[PDB]
Amino acid sequence: YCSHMIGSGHLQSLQRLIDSQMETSCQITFEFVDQEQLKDPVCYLKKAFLLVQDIMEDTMRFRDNTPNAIAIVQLQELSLRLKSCFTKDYEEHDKACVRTFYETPLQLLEKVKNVFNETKNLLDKDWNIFSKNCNNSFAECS
């Protein structure tokens, strides 16, 4: 039942955010999963996804009551549900396998989209996928 928790309409809105942002040299600092340190395809996503949600509040922001601002609140509402399709692992590992990037906002959104797109894809195959205790795979990161 988690396979169709993430609606297709959600990726549609995200694509709009991307295709609706202005192109510039501008660059910012944001937290995100260290891809090199955490290479396991499944645990990487599980962690990447949970991370995006904390990041989303203060990173992806728009004027209140705008089409995009609504798109963001919808993505948050979506997570409140998903909170069940994931199992708690451990608190030590929050901020583990995480690094920092200094890159353009468009490049961030591309990462966020990519994370939502792959996440949805994996869920379609198996809705029980993100119940995994990745504690051991988190341990390698530093």
Binding site: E23, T24, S25, C26, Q27
Partner: protein, 186 residues
């Protein structure tokens, strides 16, 4: 721009197309005499390198399409014109800036009485050190190590001393006065 001695100051330049920043090969220069161009430092893809002469005195950094030439601490030598040349591929664009350095004037007054034939002639002295244009005057040039300019003037007053007496010092639009009011003895 205008900046005072010892202060941090920044000259800026930028690339028209806002999409590009790191791609631009930035290079700042120092216009010496005779339209001479002394390479201060360079930048490209956020790899900065300052020529060793200017090292520590100048630095370059970027934010989006804008490029900054930061003067860590200005000295009188730095007064002059600078040049930023930005290049994308074969096409190049240039921007020119004039940094005017200023040393707040220092007006000093002091006196000393004649030692012969008597002790009646008092000579007050007005000395003003500033940059770029010091000027001293009583109301009735030497170069320093800093690169500044000192200049001074004397006034002889036979007894009776017609005090008070005023000297006017100024650095262009900057100005200050020095007034000798009374001697130590009478």
């Amino acid at each position: 721009v205008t900046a005072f001695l010892g202060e941090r100051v920044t000259l800026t330049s930028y690339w028209r197309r806002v999409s590009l920043g790191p791609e631009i090969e930035v290079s700042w220069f120092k216009l010496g005499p005779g339209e001479e161009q002394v390479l201060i430092g360079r930048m490209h893809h956020d790899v900065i390198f300052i020529e060793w002469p200017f090292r520590g005195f100048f630095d370059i950094h970027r934010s989006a399409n804008t490029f900054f030439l930061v003067v860590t601490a200005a000295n009188i030598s730095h007064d002059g014109n600078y040049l930023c040349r930005m290049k994308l591929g074969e096409t190049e664009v240039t921007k020119q800036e004039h940094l005017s350095v200023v040393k707040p004037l220092t007006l000093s007054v002091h006196s000393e009485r004649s030692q012969f034939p008597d002790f009646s002639v008092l000579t007050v002295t007005c000395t003003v050190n500033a940059f770029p244009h010091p000027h001293v005057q009583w109301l009735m040039v030497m170069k320093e190590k800093d690169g500044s300019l000192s200049v001074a003037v004397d006034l002889s007053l036979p007894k009776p001393w017609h005090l008070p007496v005023t000297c006017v010092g100024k650095n262009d639009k900057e100005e200050a006065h020095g007034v000798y009011v009374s001697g130590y003895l009478s």
